[PDB]
Amino acid sequence: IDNCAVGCPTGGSSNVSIVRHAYTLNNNSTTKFANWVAYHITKDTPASGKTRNWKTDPALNPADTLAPADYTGANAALKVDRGHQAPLASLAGVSDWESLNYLSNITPQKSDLNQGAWARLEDQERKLIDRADISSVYTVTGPLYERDMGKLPGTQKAHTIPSAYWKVIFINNSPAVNHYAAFLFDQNTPKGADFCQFRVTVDEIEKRTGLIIWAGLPDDVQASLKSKPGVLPELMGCKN
Amino acid sequence: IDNCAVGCPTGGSSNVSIVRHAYTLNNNSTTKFANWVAYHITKDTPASGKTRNWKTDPALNPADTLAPADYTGANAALKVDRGHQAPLASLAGVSDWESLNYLSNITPQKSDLNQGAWARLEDQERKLIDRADISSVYTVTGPLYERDMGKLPGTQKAHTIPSAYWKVIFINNSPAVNHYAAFLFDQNTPKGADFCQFRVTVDEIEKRTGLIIWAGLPDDVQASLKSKPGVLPELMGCKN
Ligand SMILES: [Mg+2]
Ligand SMILES: [Mg+2]
């Protein structure tokens, strides 16, 4: 199962990644959240109406990830939601869809971001697959840890709440020949914010995460395309 | 023969276009030069060392195009060369390659442009086909008539010398999913100019020519991408 197409990211804290049909993920046993999550949307992956039964990822050591009990009181204290990294509705059609609700694929994401600009991007990201000429959407998403966001009140486990979230997207085959995009949202993004205003370069993300995305691309392609914002957002309703 | 892939341009002065393996061209009987020339570069079309036997296009009425005799004294008076619209070296491998030297595919192009930035772009355009993942390069090129440039000294034929040239390019299948680019050079472009500094939008070209490029693309795709400069030039050595 290849959920990256042009090479999954290198630089993750964990040397081994979890590969599922729903996604491929690299966990961080120190922060308790995934360094990055790569997924592949196709015409047969989206599905609506699925339920959200939060569960501890059975593939990880319970001490290196969070359990449902750890989120107790989180919303009232920090105004955060249990935010999905790999989106439920866009991939709930896969055989192991339940893993989309494993806490390894979740982080304490501010409600205004989760239900705001982040959800609208997910909506447009999913809509791309409806286009006749678009057969695949390959996405890599993950958090940033640049400032103290406080701690979950219901757990004694050492963890680090993200300060921002990014998403790198490309359609069909490879960014070497296809449209791509990259976004970066701060945890405190306003509820009504236009997701189009947060377009960035892949290079910026790599520099703020320590990862190398699209790690299988030839050197020249990486050097010339990663520092240039893509035009994929224009197909998602964005301008300029 | 389809040299446009996503619909040849509309808006040309002639209702009929000339279709060849080398290119598809729409002539302008008033200016005596083609409104647009569309060509398709593949790994099989380039070829070096071909001779240049200028000739009157036998497919057109002699009064609507130029003959070799019409260029007499042109270089000494206006410092222009017999400039190819569809590049010889990039397509000389096709079966009717001699048509690349028919005067319907030529215009009085300033030597500094023809042998400068224009030739450098042609090189990079041709080199794209050397990439393993790039199987096709679809280009549409043509002149602009915005200012009096004088007249050829060796002809009595009514004609209009171009004041600028544009080139729209995309790779593989369609600009809807593949990288694209558009450039526009004034006749007076200095010999040592960096072609990367002449990137424009497809919309600007359409507004200045009266043509509609990629006329077969869905409306939403046209509105969305024609106003956004592409990232293909980054694969051609351009920065930012
Ligand atoms: Mg969410
Ligand atoms: Mg030339």
Tab-separated table of C-alpha atoms and ligand atoms in Angstrom:
chain	number	residue	atom	x	y	z
A	1	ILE	CA	0.000	0.000	0.000
A	2	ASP	CA	1.528	3.266	-1.215
A	3	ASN	CA	-0.276	6.310	0.190
A	4	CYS	CA	2.495	8.694	-0.875
A	5	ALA	CA	3.174	7.902	-4.552
A	6	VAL	CA	6.387	9.964	-4.730
A	7	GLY	CA	7.941	8.840	-1.467
A	8	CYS	CA	6.628	9.287	2.057
A	9	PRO	CA	8.335	12.014	4.143
A	10	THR	CA	11.706	11.438	5.802
A	11	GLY	CA	12.762	13.130	9.025
A	12	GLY	CA	10.045	11.718	11.261
A	13	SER	CA	10.892	10.965	14.898
A	14	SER	CA	9.881	7.331	14.500
A	15	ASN	CA	11.900	5.079	12.195
A	16	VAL	CA	8.924	2.886	11.347
A	17	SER	CA	5.566	4.127	10.077
A	18	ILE	CA	2.112	2.569	10.337
A	19	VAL	CA	0.715	1.661	6.924
A	20	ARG	CA	-3.028	1.164	6.497
A	21	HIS	CA	-5.473	1.530	3.638
A	22	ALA	CA	-6.847	4.665	5.273
A	23	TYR	CA	-3.418	6.274	5.612
A	24	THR	CA	0.264	5.951	6.458
A	25	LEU	CA	1.365	7.605	9.678
A	26	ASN	CA	4.578	8.375	11.537
A	27	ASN	CA	4.053	8.653	15.294
A	28	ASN	CA	5.944	10.786	17.790
A	29	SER	CA	6.116	9.034	21.156
A	30	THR	CA	7.221	12.280	22.810
A	31	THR	CA	4.405	14.605	21.703
A	32	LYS	CA	1.917	11.694	21.539
A	33	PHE	CA	0.734	12.869	18.116
A	34	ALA	CA	1.694	11.899	14.551
A	35	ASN	CA	4.529	13.843	12.891
A	36	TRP	CA	2.789	13.403	9.559
A	37	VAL	CA	-0.096	11.504	8.019
A	38	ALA	CA	-0.223	10.718	4.310
A	39	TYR	CA	-3.389	9.578	2.573
A	40	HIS	CA	-4.710	8.829	-0.896
A	41	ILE	CA	-8.203	9.913	-1.894
A	42	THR	CA	-9.786	8.159	-4.874
A	43	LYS	CA	-13.330	8.021	-6.205
A	44	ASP	CA	-14.008	4.964	-4.032
A	45	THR	CA	-12.696	6.230	-0.685
A	46	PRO	CA	-15.181	8.911	0.417
A	47	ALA	CA	-18.159	7.849	2.526
A	48	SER	CA	-20.568	9.798	4.715
A	49	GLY	CA	-22.646	8.963	7.777
A	50	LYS	CA	-19.932	7.013	9.581
A	51	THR	CA	-19.774	7.237	13.378
A	52	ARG	CA	-16.922	8.435	15.567
A	53	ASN	CA	-15.898	5.777	18.092
A	54	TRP	CA	-12.603	7.117	19.464
A	55	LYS	CA	-10.083	4.382	20.312
A	56	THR	CA	-6.457	3.995	21.321
A	57	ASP	CA	-4.374	2.906	18.329
A	58	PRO	CA	-3.823	-0.834	18.912
A	59	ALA	CA	-0.666	-0.823	16.780
A	60	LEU	CA	1.216	1.504	19.127
A	61	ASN	CA	2.527	1.176	22.665
A	62	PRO	CA	-0.214	2.687	24.890
A	63	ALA	CA	2.424	4.884	26.546
A	64	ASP	CA	3.434	6.503	23.232
A	65	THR	CA	-0.053	7.659	22.249
A	66	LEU	CA	-3.239	9.009	23.864
A	67	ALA	CA	-6.345	7.128	25.045
A	68	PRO	CA	-9.962	8.386	24.877
A	69	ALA	CA	-9.854	9.090	28.622
A	70	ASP	CA	-7.042	11.599	28.076
A	71	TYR	CA	-9.408	14.060	26.377
A	72	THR	CA	-11.716	14.419	29.386
A	73	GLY	CA	-12.494	18.084	30.005
A	74	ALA	CA	-10.305	19.127	27.071
A	75	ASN	CA	-13.068	21.092	25.326
A	76	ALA	CA	-14.125	23.127	28.363
A	77	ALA	CA	-10.540	23.951	29.315
A	78	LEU	CA	-8.826	24.616	25.974
A	79	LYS	CA	-11.757	24.908	23.565
A	80	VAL	CA	-10.303	22.124	21.442
A	81	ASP	CA	-11.978	19.325	19.476
A	82	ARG	CA	-10.699	15.844	18.712
A	83	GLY	CA	-9.436	16.883	15.282
A	84	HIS	CA	-8.757	14.351	12.537
A	85	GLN	CA	-5.497	14.630	10.594
A	86	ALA	CA	-6.576	12.257	7.801
A	87	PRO	CA	-10.239	13.276	7.172
A	88	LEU	CA	-13.004	10.806	8.046
A	89	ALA	CA	-15.514	11.619	5.287
A	90	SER	CA	-12.918	11.598	2.491
A	91	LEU	CA	-11.608	8.151	3.371
A	92	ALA	CA	-14.318	6.335	5.373
A	93	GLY	CA	-14.903	4.036	2.399
A	94	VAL	CA	-11.705	2.044	2.922
A	95	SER	CA	-11.713	-1.409	4.541
A	96	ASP	CA	-9.969	-0.289	7.738
A	97	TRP	CA	-11.889	3.002	7.979
A	98	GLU	CA	-12.275	2.584	11.749
A	99	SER	CA	-8.582	3.460	12.120
A	100	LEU	CA	-9.484	7.009	11.062
A	101	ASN	CA	-10.877	7.405	14.566
A	102	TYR	CA	-7.832	5.948	16.327
A	103	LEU	CA	-6.283	8.669	18.502
A	104	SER	CA	-2.995	8.381	16.609
A	105	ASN	CA	-4.850	10.214	13.821
A	106	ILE	CA	-6.194	12.830	16.236
A	107	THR	CA	-4.810	15.915	18.013
A	108	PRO	CA	-6.344	18.612	20.261
A	109	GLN	CA	-7.322	21.055	17.500
A	110	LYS	CA	-9.016	24.385	18.326
A	111	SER	CA	-12.734	24.070	17.570
A	112	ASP	CA	-12.763	27.245	15.485
A	113	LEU	CA	-10.063	25.836	13.219
A	114	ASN	CA	-11.443	22.274	13.091
A	115	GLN	CA	-14.951	23.468	12.212
A	116	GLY	CA	-13.712	26.471	10.249
A	117	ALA	CA	-11.056	26.977	7.574
A	118	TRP	CA	-9.715	23.449	8.120
A	119	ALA	CA	-13.107	21.871	7.384
A	120	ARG	CA	-13.637	24.052	4.322
A	121	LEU	CA	-10.254	22.982	2.926
A	122	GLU	CA	-11.134	19.333	3.558
A	123	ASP	CA	-14.380	19.945	1.685
A	124	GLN	CA	-12.616	21.387	-1.373
A	125	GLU	CA	-9.909	18.726	-1.161
A	126	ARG	CA	-12.589	16.025	-1.285
A	127	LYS	CA	-14.432	17.820	-4.102
A	128	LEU	CA	-11.370	17.575	-6.362
A	129	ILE	CA	-11.974	13.850	-6.744
A	130	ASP	CA	-15.366	14.597	-8.289
A	131	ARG	CA	-13.630	16.053	-11.355
A	132	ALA	CA	-13.578	13.681	-14.317
A	133	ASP	CA	-9.884	14.247	-15.072
A	134	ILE	CA	-8.749	13.844	-11.451
A	135	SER	CA	-8.252	10.218	-10.399
A	136	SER	CA	-6.200	10.689	-7.237
A	137	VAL	CA	-5.505	13.215	-4.524
A	138	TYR	CA	-2.345	12.562	-2.523
A	139	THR	CA	-2.099	14.515	0.699
A	140	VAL	CA	0.405	14.825	3.532
A	141	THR	CA	-0.643	16.670	6.666
A	142	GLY	CA	0.815	17.186	10.123
A	143	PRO	CA	1.306	19.590	13.059
A	144	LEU	CA	3.860	22.257	13.992
A	145	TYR	CA	5.198	22.713	17.537
A	146	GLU	CA	6.469	26.276	17.802
A	147	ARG	CA	4.881	27.552	21.003
A	148	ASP	CA	3.406	26.297	24.267
A	149	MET	CA	-0.322	25.659	23.876
A	150	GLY	CA	-0.844	24.350	27.392
A	151	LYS	CA	-1.763	20.810	28.406
A	152	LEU	CA	-4.788	18.509	28.337
A	153	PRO	CA	-6.398	18.624	31.812
A	154	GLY	CA	-7.425	14.967	31.900
A	155	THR	CA	-4.066	13.231	31.547
A	156	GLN	CA	-0.727	12.855	33.308
A	157	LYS	CA	0.987	11.684	30.121
A	158	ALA	CA	3.669	14.037	28.821
A	159	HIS	CA	2.434	15.502	25.533
A	160	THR	CA	2.735	18.594	23.352
A	161	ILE	CA	-0.283	20.273	21.787
A	162	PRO	CA	0.397	21.534	18.225
A	163	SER	CA	0.505	25.267	17.525
A	164	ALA	CA	-0.342	24.926	13.827
A	165	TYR	CA	-1.283	22.443	11.096
A	166	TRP	CA	-0.154	22.143	7.488
A	167	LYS	CA	-1.359	20.246	4.440
A	168	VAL	CA	0.479	19.454	1.203
A	169	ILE	CA	-1.615	18.282	-1.742
A	170	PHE	CA	-1.104	17.159	-5.331
A	171	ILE	CA	-3.340	15.436	-7.849
A	172	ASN	CA	-3.038	12.323	-9.985
A	173	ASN	CA	0.581	11.248	-10.525
A	174	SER	CA	3.242	13.549	-9.123
A	175	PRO	CA	3.937	17.206	-8.344
A	176	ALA	CA	6.660	16.877	-10.976
A	177	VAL	CA	3.937	17.182	-13.628
A	178	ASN	CA	0.644	17.837	-11.770
A	179	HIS	CA	-0.903	20.743	-9.863
A	180	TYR	CA	-0.042	20.930	-6.161
A	181	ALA	CA	-0.748	23.056	-3.111
A	182	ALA	CA	0.383	23.677	0.451
A	183	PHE	CA	-1.404	25.384	3.341
A	184	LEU	CA	-0.440	26.331	6.893
A	185	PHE	CA	-2.971	27.251	9.608
A	186	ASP	CA	-2.300	28.558	13.110
A	187	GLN	CA	-4.329	26.950	15.907
A	188	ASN	CA	-5.932	30.331	16.556
A	189	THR	CA	-7.238	30.861	13.023
A	190	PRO	CA	-10.612	32.686	13.164
A	191	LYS	CA	-13.736	30.586	12.586
A	192	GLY	CA	-14.740	32.478	9.446
A	193	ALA	CA	-11.279	32.675	7.886
A	194	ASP	CA	-10.903	32.011	4.150
A	195	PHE	CA	-8.595	29.007	3.776
A	196	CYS	CA	-7.218	30.518	0.568
A	197	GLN	CA	-5.306	33.124	2.564
A	198	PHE	CA	-3.048	30.491	4.118
A	199	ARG	CA	-1.298	29.176	1.032
A	200	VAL	CA	2.440	28.595	1.568
A	201	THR	CA	5.312	26.735	-0.094
A	202	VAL	CA	6.341	23.145	0.645
A	203	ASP	CA	9.783	24.541	1.446
A	204	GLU	CA	8.379	26.621	4.319
A	205	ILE	CA	6.740	23.543	5.825
A	206	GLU	CA	9.911	21.452	5.569
A	207	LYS	CA	11.905	24.220	7.253
A	208	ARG	CA	9.460	24.448	10.158
A	209	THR	CA	9.018	20.692	10.662
A	210	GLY	CA	12.419	19.197	9.863
A	211	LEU	CA	10.859	16.784	7.370
A	212	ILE	CA	11.442	16.259	3.667
A	213	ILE	CA	8.145	15.831	1.830
A	214	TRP	CA	7.918	14.039	-1.539
A	215	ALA	CA	11.269	12.493	-0.584
A	216	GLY	CA	11.416	10.287	-3.681
A	217	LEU	CA	11.444	13.118	-6.225
A	218	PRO	CA	14.614	13.848	-8.225
A	219	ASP	CA	16.791	16.533	-6.601
A	220	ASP	CA	16.258	19.099	-9.375
A	221	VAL	CA	12.467	18.772	-9.208
A	222	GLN	CA	12.519	19.215	-5.429
A	223	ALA	CA	14.733	22.297	-5.608
A	224	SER	CA	12.677	24.084	-8.262
A	225	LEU	CA	9.116	23.227	-7.215
A	226	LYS	CA	9.199	23.228	-3.402
A	227	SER	CA	9.894	26.958	-3.163
A	228	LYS	CA	7.076	27.846	-5.573
A	229	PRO	CA	3.422	28.026	-4.451
A	230	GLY	CA	1.275	25.746	-6.600
A	231	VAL	CA	-1.797	26.550	-8.690
A	232	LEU	CA	-4.012	23.728	-7.389
A	233	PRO	CA	-5.858	26.151	-5.031
A	234	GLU	CA	-7.280	27.896	-8.109
A	235	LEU	CA	-9.224	24.711	-8.847
A	236	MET	CA	-10.470	24.869	-5.264
A	237	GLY	CA	-12.019	28.318	-5.622
A	238	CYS	CA	-9.060	30.495	-4.602
A	239	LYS	CA	-7.942	33.575	-6.548
A	240	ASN	CA	-4.519	35.061	-7.322
B	1	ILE	CA	-4.004	15.176	-36.464
B	2	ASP	CA	-4.482	16.949	-33.120
B	3	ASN	CA	-1.759	19.466	-32.288
B	4	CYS	CA	-3.839	21.211	-29.622
B	5	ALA	CA	-5.144	18.447	-27.320
B	6	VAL	CA	-7.596	20.733	-25.489
B	7	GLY	CA	-8.994	22.620	-28.465
B	8	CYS	CA	-7.144	24.873	-30.894
B	9	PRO	CA	-7.620	28.627	-30.418
B	10	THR	CA	-10.776	30.357	-31.622
B	11	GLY	CA	-10.860	33.945	-32.835
B	12	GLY	CA	-8.441	33.565	-35.735
B	13	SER	CA	-9.115	35.624	-38.872
B	14	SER	CA	-9.425	32.508	-41.060
B	15	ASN	CA	-12.286	30.049	-40.610
B	16	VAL	CA	-9.998	27.321	-41.905
B	17	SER	CA	-6.690	26.285	-40.384
B	18	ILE	CA	-3.907	24.344	-42.086
B	19	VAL	CA	-3.233	21.027	-40.357
B	20	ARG	CA	0.130	19.300	-40.705
B	21	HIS	CA	2.212	16.878	-38.668
B	22	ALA	CA	4.617	19.742	-38.020
B	23	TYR	CA	1.906	22.101	-36.775
B	24	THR	CA	-1.583	23.517	-37.159
B	25	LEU	CA	-1.718	27.107	-38.351
B	26	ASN	CA	-4.323	29.828	-38.828
B	27	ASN	CA	-3.254	32.375	-41.417
B	28	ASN	CA	-4.096	36.059	-41.607
B	29	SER	CA	-4.420	37.195	-45.221
B	30	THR	CA	-4.223	40.850	-44.173
B	31	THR	CA	-1.008	40.879	-42.108
B	32	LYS	CA	0.420	38.008	-44.219
B	33	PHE	CA	1.511	36.179	-41.057
B	34	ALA	CA	-0.134	33.426	-39.009
B	35	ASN	CA	-2.490	34.426	-36.183
B	36	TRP	CA	-1.363	31.415	-34.188
B	37	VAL	CA	0.664	28.270	-34.665
B	38	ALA	CA	0.028	25.222	-32.515
B	39	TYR	CA	2.498	22.367	-32.289
B	40	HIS	CA	3.050	19.136	-30.392
B	41	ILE	CA	6.552	18.139	-29.334
B	42	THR	CA	7.215	14.486	-28.507
B	43	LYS	CA	10.418	12.492	-28.039
B	44	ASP	CA	10.198	11.583	-31.731
B	45	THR	CA	9.903	15.077	-33.238
B	46	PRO	CA	13.206	16.812	-32.463
B	47	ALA	CA	15.982	16.609	-35.063
B	48	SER	CA	19.196	18.531	-35.714
B	49	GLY	CA	21.085	19.565	-38.842
B	50	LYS	CA	18.136	20.217	-41.146
B	51	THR	CA	18.550	22.755	-43.942
B	52	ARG	CA	16.452	25.897	-44.346
B	53	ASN	CA	14.973	26.200	-47.833
B	54	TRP	CA	12.568	29.108	-47.455
B	55	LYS	CA	9.434	28.622	-49.540
B	56	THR	CA	6.010	30.092	-50.259
B	57	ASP	CA	3.375	27.919	-48.573
B	58	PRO	CA	1.751	25.925	-51.413
B	59	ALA	CA	-1.419	25.452	-49.354
B	60	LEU	CA	-2.247	29.162	-49.397
B	61	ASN	CA	-3.163	31.677	-52.075
B	62	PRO	CA	0.097	33.479	-53.025
B	63	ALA	CA	-1.556	36.852	-52.389
B	64	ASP	CA	-2.354	36.004	-48.746
B	65	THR	CA	1.173	35.053	-47.701
B	66	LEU	CA	4.783	36.077	-48.370
B	67	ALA	CA	7.328	34.659	-50.834
B	68	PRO	CA	11.122	34.361	-50.294
B	69	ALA	CA	11.717	37.363	-52.555
B	70	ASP	CA	9.750	39.577	-50.130
B	71	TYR	CA	12.520	39.380	-47.511
B	72	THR	CA	15.188	40.920	-49.750
B	73	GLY	CA	17.038	43.658	-47.872
B	74	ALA	CA	15.020	43.069	-44.700
B	75	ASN	CA	17.956	42.287	-42.407
B	76	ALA	CA	19.967	45.343	-43.466
B	77	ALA	CA	17.024	47.719	-43.121
B	78	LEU	CA	15.141	46.457	-40.047
B	79	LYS	CA	17.647	44.076	-38.474
B	80	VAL	CA	15.131	41.236	-38.622
B	81	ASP	CA	15.620	37.524	-39.305
B	82	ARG	CA	13.307	35.012	-40.925
B	83	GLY	CA	11.927	33.925	-37.549
B	84	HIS	CA	10.211	30.566	-37.138
B	85	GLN	CA	6.965	30.466	-35.155
B	86	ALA	CA	6.979	26.666	-34.770
B	87	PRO	CA	10.656	25.797	-34.034
B	88	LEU	CA	12.578	23.853	-36.674
B	89	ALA	CA	14.869	21.879	-34.348
B	90	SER	CA	12.028	20.747	-32.060
B	91	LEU	CA	9.855	19.351	-34.848
B	92	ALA	CA	12.130	18.631	-37.829
B	93	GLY	CA	11.610	14.918	-37.201
B	94	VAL	CA	8.039	14.829	-38.533
B	95	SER	CA	7.269	13.608	-42.061
B	96	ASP	CA	6.386	17.039	-43.480
B	97	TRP	CA	9.210	18.875	-41.716
B	98	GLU	CA	9.967	21.014	-44.806
B	99	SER	CA	6.755	22.928	-44.067
B	100	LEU	CA	8.503	24.393	-41.013
B	101	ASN	CA	10.361	26.551	-43.519
B	102	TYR	CA	7.278	27.641	-45.470
B	103	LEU	CA	6.930	31.402	-45.033
B	104	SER	CA	3.521	30.989	-43.380
B	105	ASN	CA	5.509	29.781	-40.353
B	106	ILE	CA	7.883	32.750	-40.530
B	107	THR	CA	7.693	36.463	-39.646
B	108	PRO	CA	10.213	39.347	-39.673
B	109	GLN	CA	11.552	38.836	-36.148
B	110	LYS	CA	14.249	41.102	-34.677
B	111	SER	CA	17.587	39.269	-34.724
B	112	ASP	CA	18.254	40.080	-31.070
B	113	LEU	CA	14.994	38.438	-30.042
B	114	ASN	CA	15.209	35.522	-32.504
B	115	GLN	CA	18.773	34.698	-31.455
B	116	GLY	CA	18.322	35.798	-27.854
B	117	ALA	CA	15.591	35.174	-25.290
B	118	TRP	CA	13.331	33.544	-27.878
B	119	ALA	CA	15.986	30.949	-28.774
B	120	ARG	CA	16.726	30.322	-25.101
B	121	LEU	CA	13.044	29.627	-24.421
B	122	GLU	CA	12.935	27.305	-27.433
B	123	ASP	CA	15.880	25.387	-25.944
B	124	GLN	CA	14.236	24.926	-22.539
B	125	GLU	CA	10.933	24.068	-24.219
B	126	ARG	CA	12.702	21.351	-26.201
B	127	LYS	CA	14.635	20.061	-23.185
B	128	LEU	CA	11.381	19.417	-21.305
B	129	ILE	CA	10.806	16.440	-23.595
B	130	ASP	CA	14.034	14.884	-22.298
B	131	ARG	CA	12.417	14.335	-18.895
B	132	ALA	CA	11.288	10.759	-18.286
B	133	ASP	CA	7.857	11.767	-16.991
B	134	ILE	CA	7.147	14.263	-19.779
B	135	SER	CA	5.794	12.681	-22.954
B	136	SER	CA	4.296	15.732	-24.647
B	137	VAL	CA	4.722	19.476	-24.893
B	138	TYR	CA	1.798	21.334	-26.444
B	139	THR	CA	2.521	24.864	-27.506
B	140	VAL	CA	0.578	27.676	-29.141
B	141	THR	CA	2.520	30.719	-30.308
B	142	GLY	CA	1.744	33.835	-32.315
B	143	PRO	CA	2.421	37.553	-32.909
B	144	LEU	CA	0.941	40.754	-31.505
B	145	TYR	CA	0.272	43.896	-33.547
B	146	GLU	CA	0.264	46.871	-31.208
B	147	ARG	CA	2.598	49.408	-32.804
B	148	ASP	CA	3.928	50.354	-36.243
B	149	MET	CA	7.183	48.491	-36.895
B	150	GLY	CA	7.793	49.685	-40.442
B	151	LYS	CA	7.591	47.637	-43.644
B	152	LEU	CA	9.743	45.089	-45.468
B	153	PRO	CA	11.761	47.046	-48.087
B	154	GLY	CA	11.632	44.299	-50.701
B	155	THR	CA	7.882	43.871	-51.234
B	156	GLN	CA	4.854	45.741	-52.580
B	157	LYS	CA	2.516	43.425	-50.664
B	158	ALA	CA	0.422	44.949	-47.887
B	159	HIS	CA	1.647	43.418	-44.615
B	160	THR	CA	1.983	44.194	-40.916
B	161	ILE	CA	5.179	43.383	-39.041
B	162	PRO	CA	4.541	42.000	-35.519
B	163	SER	CA	5.477	44.130	-32.515
B	164	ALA	CA	5.610	41.213	-30.073
B	165	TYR	CA	5.393	37.431	-29.733
B	166	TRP	CA	3.737	35.137	-27.198
B	167	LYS	CA	3.974	31.451	-26.382
B	168	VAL	CA	1.650	29.335	-24.230
B	169	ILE	CA	2.892	25.921	-23.112
B	170	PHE	CA	1.666	22.948	-21.110
B	171	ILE	CA	2.930	19.405	-20.692
B	172	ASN	CA	1.450	15.945	-21.131
B	173	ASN	CA	-2.358	15.992	-21.062
B	174	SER	CA	-4.037	19.276	-20.192
B	175	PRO	CA	-3.382	22.496	-18.264
B	176	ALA	CA	-6.371	21.380	-16.190
B	177	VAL	CA	-4.084	18.911	-14.384
B	178	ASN	CA	-0.579	19.631	-15.777
B	179	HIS	CA	1.976	22.416	-15.384
B	180	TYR	CA	1.699	25.285	-17.865
B	181	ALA	CA	3.381	28.552	-18.795
B	182	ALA	CA	2.897	31.665	-20.908
B	183	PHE	CA	5.485	34.174	-22.093
B	184	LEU	CA	5.313	37.418	-24.063
B	185	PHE	CA	8.310	39.141	-25.682
B	186	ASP	CA	8.409	42.549	-27.360
B	187	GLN	CA	10.297	42.686	-30.667
B	188	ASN	CA	12.826	45.021	-29.047
B	189	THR	CA	13.847	42.586	-26.302
B	190	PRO	CA	17.610	42.939	-25.630
B	191	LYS	CA	19.803	40.087	-26.866
B	192	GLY	CA	20.958	39.090	-23.381
B	193	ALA	CA	17.507	39.126	-21.786
B	194	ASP	CA	16.528	36.344	-19.364
B	195	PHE	CA	13.355	34.773	-20.784
B	196	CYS	CA	12.237	34.068	-17.210
B	197	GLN	CA	11.441	37.765	-16.817
B	198	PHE	CA	8.708	37.626	-19.464
B	199	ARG	CA	6.222	35.280	-17.833
B	200	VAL	CA	2.613	36.447	-18.197
B	201	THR	CA	-0.897	35.009	-17.816
B	202	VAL	CA	-2.862	33.363	-20.618
B	203	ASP	CA	-5.610	35.912	-19.986
B	204	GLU	CA	-3.337	38.830	-20.839
B	205	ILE	CA	-2.439	37.185	-24.157
B	206	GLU	CA	-6.117	36.589	-24.957
B	207	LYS	CA	-7.009	40.203	-24.172
B	208	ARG	CA	-4.262	41.509	-26.461
B	209	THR	CA	-4.842	39.088	-29.356
B	210	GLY	CA	-8.609	38.572	-29.432
B	211	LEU	CA	-8.093	34.811	-29.353
B	212	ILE	CA	-9.285	32.185	-26.898
B	213	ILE	CA	-6.519	29.671	-26.154
B	214	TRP	CA	-7.323	26.113	-25.009
B	215	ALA	CA	-10.862	26.753	-26.264
B	216	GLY	CA	-12.080	23.231	-25.489
B	217	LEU	CA	-11.522	23.386	-21.726
B	218	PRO	CA	-14.521	23.462	-19.351
B	219	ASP	CA	-15.571	27.011	-18.408
B	220	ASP	CA	-14.587	26.770	-14.739
B	221	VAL	CA	-11.094	25.553	-15.653
B	222	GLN	CA	-10.614	28.421	-18.091
B	223	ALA	CA	-11.779	31.104	-15.677
B	224	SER	CA	-9.646	29.634	-12.902
B	225	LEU	CA	-6.279	29.040	-14.553
B	226	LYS	CA	-6.027	31.610	-17.343
B	227	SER	CA	-5.480	34.370	-14.788
B	228	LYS	CA	-2.872	32.454	-12.789
B	229	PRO	CA	0.738	32.334	-14.001
B	230	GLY	CA	1.888	28.721	-14.214
B	231	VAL	CA	4.808	26.972	-12.546
B	232	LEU	CA	6.187	25.170	-15.603
B	233	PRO	CA	8.971	27.789	-15.976
B	234	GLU	CA	10.405	26.528	-12.672
B	235	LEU	CA	11.188	23.271	-14.470
B	236	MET	CA	12.875	25.380	-17.152
B	237	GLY	CA	15.377	26.976	-14.787
B	238	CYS	CA	13.425	30.028	-13.628
B	239	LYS	CA	13.323	31.118	-9.985
B	240	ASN	CA	10.380	32.616	-8.092
C	1	MG	MG	-11.749	17.790	11.648
C	2	MG	MG	14.002	31.409	-34.343
